[PDB]
Design a binder for this molecule. Structure first.
Ligand SMILES: CC(=O)N[C@@H]1[C@@H](O)[C@H](O[C@@H]2O[C@H](CO)[C@@H](O[C@@H]3O[C@H](CO)[C@@H](O)[C@H](O)[C@H]3NC(C)=O)[C@H](O)[C@H]2NC(C)=O)[C@@H](CO)O[C@H]1O
Ligand SMILES: CC(=O)N[C@@H]1[C@@H](O)[C@H](O[C@@H]2O[C@H](CO)[C@@H](O[C@@H]3O[C@H](CO)[C@@H](O)[C@H](O)[C@H]3NC(C)=O)[C@H](O)[C@H]2NC(C)=O)[C@@H](CO)O[C@H]1O
Ligand code: MG
Ligand code: MG
Ligand code: ZN
Ligand code: ZN
Lengths: 403, 403
């Protein structure tokens, strides 16, 4: 294949989600949906009476569901969060101002999302394609927690005053806004809960969101495919416009990202209504795009496979990454996987390479790494592979406490 | 050793928890604490201004923290939950009446509990003895979800009308109250989120909870040790009194329970205050009990080890149970454990034996088992070990859909 495309839809489930799902199904592909459950509560200020129907249809159809937080951080856009807050923030347009504030509260929003999903669909955990507790994406933010060495933030994603399309707006990646700094902490809290987070390469959207009637300004299928072609293997998160969609320190050429393109779009752009004629104009674009992307030799996949699943009978080179039971592992030596050689916290063939900061078993630590353990922070003084008896609090050779 | 004692403390963290912890530490034992985070919000109606101090002290001292739900189900004791609800329910004493109503909301209370703990102590996931997301116990309820074949419920734990001690109160284990039925669904929901739950063998309690000043009438250290000796290998959950603390269908002689006694008590019974002189009278009892228990050849352990942890080097017999990363596994073949042979979803040496009902990989299913998959129920038609290709919806020779 020329490469792998990951279609990711954000900010559902809403009414328009239903027809998007039908189009994917007709096109013979699976996508990943990053949902905000407040639409199930009827308070997300969209046409969303069919929210639960959409949720069920996505899972019944085999699409992957991931976590985009409960309320899309709207609680940071208003003084007091309530049933009208979505409408209030829509009135002001202040979604990317002060978007992140208290990182502990903001991270908790991702757990609340799961509570609400499991309330409206009590059987949701009986679906393997429900990945709401493993896969996440932060509102507004092109940020990544993929492996121990594949992590990077969207350093201009959100603002402390002006919107990115407003005159006089300035971002200094070397000195991120307060909101961005909080978003980085959220990333880290989620990673320690076992989440991976992923951003995107290309966004099927208007030029920017200051743009009026945005649903009417989506790129056509063929030029969008051209844009995808340009993204492939060109470190798109660093070159993408506008500036608040950038991931500045994205690890260019990192092997896990080779021959892949992650597409962001939004369910609500496929609705005929207050944003334009989305369903009439954009659903056929999505249909056509899938078609011509396959002809060009692309295949489509989901974010639960972005990091490839460990597979018996596959030959791995040393340093290759696999995903196993929601945890990332890195091959210690080149070898062919056997049934009883699976990655684990004691495997000789793999080390845990999750993007977390809490001290963890079977991790190859490097000098300078900082770990959290029993409420304290330790510097790795001597590079080593962690094991159960070498805990930071009692191994003075390996770890030095800060500070 | 004669046997293993598991001291389990319910309903903390409160002020009284602090000196309890000091006594455990002085006695050189570790214990398991089943906490309700509403005390950290200051609304649990106890002396709890030192709640956070207590939480931190328990974790710094190596004790295990388990999940007892956010509010101890007090939301089902009042018409509308708020800051006064603990006090309101303490005024009526209706805790065991309608204690469980909507199992989905009641289970969510356990998740809310973790949000609150991780809010007041943001570094709490850095403690390995934090087991809030793995180990639980239901308020009021001697209920168990340990393995696929070790599961049982407290069939008279809570009522649909009167207090258990009241005249007129009737309990029929063959026709459990609605509150009990709801609590059973709570167990199943928690199990499907990967929780184990455990009840207790003996309860260090007042003579009777029906009458005032319960802290004063706690059994002395020596006679309590005799209660423990008597409970050893005697299936105490079936013989325990009163009827409301019983686990009627507890699996007598089940292998994981051999030579073990789980003790229940409550932190608040060790406080000088509204329940009596608990600190003055009962702390010494606990100090003595630990001393003489050890002297009699008992060891003390924590609930994270109740199901023994898989350990490299140890030799296992076919049929033996281990715990590995919060998941219960059962040995397929007798062997000595090696580094590369951790139990998992692909191991040929172990099968998954978690107490869950959702279809799960690498489970040894038997004819008659019932599983949930993608929102539907299936009956196992022929015995087999589950694997990725053999999903219920595609294997009608192995599974039969239930209408
Ligand atoms: C300069 C520029 O355009 N930057 C783009 C970012 O704005 C954009 O983030 C997305 O922004 C839009 C608009 O602010 C978000 O849409 C809002 O979503 C909320 C919740 O669904 C909804 O209540 C609002 O109505 C809706 N606003 C409008 C005007 O329709 C959208 O969710 C943001 N994206 C993510 C992943 O959270 C990013 C990504 O498109 O692109 C930048 O170029
Ligand atoms: C008929 C009989 O003896 N039943 C016993 C049960 O009462 C007892 O379960 C525990 O009961 C106590 C007393 O109600 C519960 O205490 C309450 O706990 C809440 C929340 O922490 C607190 O707000 C109330 O003030 C407090 N009541 C009092 C009088 O102090 C306690 O939570 C129950 N236990 C558990 C694990 O949830 C059981 C076990 O001791 O024995 C029964 O026989
Ligand atoms: Mg993970
Ligand atoms: Mg578990
Ligand atoms: Zn979004
Ligand atoms: Zn309790």
């Amino acid at each position: 294949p020329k490469g792998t495309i990951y279609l990711t839809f954000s900010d559902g489930p809403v009414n328009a989600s239903v027809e998007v799902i039908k189009v994917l199904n007709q096109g013979g592909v699976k996508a990943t949906f990053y949902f905000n459950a407040w639409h199930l509560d009827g308070i997300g200020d969209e046409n969303e009476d069919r929210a639960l129907e959409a949720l069920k249809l996505a899972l019944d159809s085999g699409h992957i569901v991931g976590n985009h937080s409960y309320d899309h951080m709207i609680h940071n856009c208003v003084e007091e969060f309530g049933p009208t807050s979505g409408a209030d923030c829509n009135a002001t347009g202040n979604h990317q101002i002060h978007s992140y504030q208290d990182p502990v509260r903001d991270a908790a929003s991702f757990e609340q999302n799961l509570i609400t999903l499991e309330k409206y669909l009590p059987t949701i955990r009986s679906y393997p394609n429900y990945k709401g507790y493993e896969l996440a994406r932060l509102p507004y933010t092109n940020g990544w927690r993929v492996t121990k060495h594949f992590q990077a933030d969207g350093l201009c994603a959100t603002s402390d005053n002006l919107k990115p399309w407003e005159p006089g707006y300035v971002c200094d990646p070397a000195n991120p806004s307060n909101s961005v700094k909080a978003s980085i902490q959220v990333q880290n809290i989620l990673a320690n809960q076992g989440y991976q987070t992923h951003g995107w390469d290309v966004d099927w959207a208007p030029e920017n969101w200051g743009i009026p009637m945005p649903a009417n300004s989506l790129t056509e299928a063929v030029p969008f495919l051209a844009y995808v072609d340009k993204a492939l293997n060109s470190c798109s998160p660093t070159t993408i416009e506008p500036i608040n969609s950038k991931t500045q320190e994205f690890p260019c050429g990192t092997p896990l990202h080779a021959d892949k393109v992650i597409v962001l779009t939004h369910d609500f752009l496929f609705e005929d209504g207050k944003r334009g004629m989305g369903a009439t104009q954009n659903l056929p674009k999505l249909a056509e795009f899938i078609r011509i992307a396959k002809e060009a030799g692309y295949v489509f996949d989901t974010m639960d496979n972005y990091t490839p699943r460990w597979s018996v009978g596959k030959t791995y080179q040393a340093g290759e990454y696999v995903l196993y039971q929601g945890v990332v592992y890195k091959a210690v030596i080149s070898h062919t996987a056997q049934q009883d050689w699976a990655p684990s916290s004691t495997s000789s063939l793999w080390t845990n390479a999750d993007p977390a900061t809490n001290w963890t078993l079977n991790v190859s630590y490097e000098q300078g790494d900082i770990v959290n353990y029993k409420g304290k922070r330790y510097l790795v003084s001597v590079p080593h592979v962690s094991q159960q008896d070498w805990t930071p609090d009692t191994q003075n050779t390996l770890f030095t406490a800060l500070e």
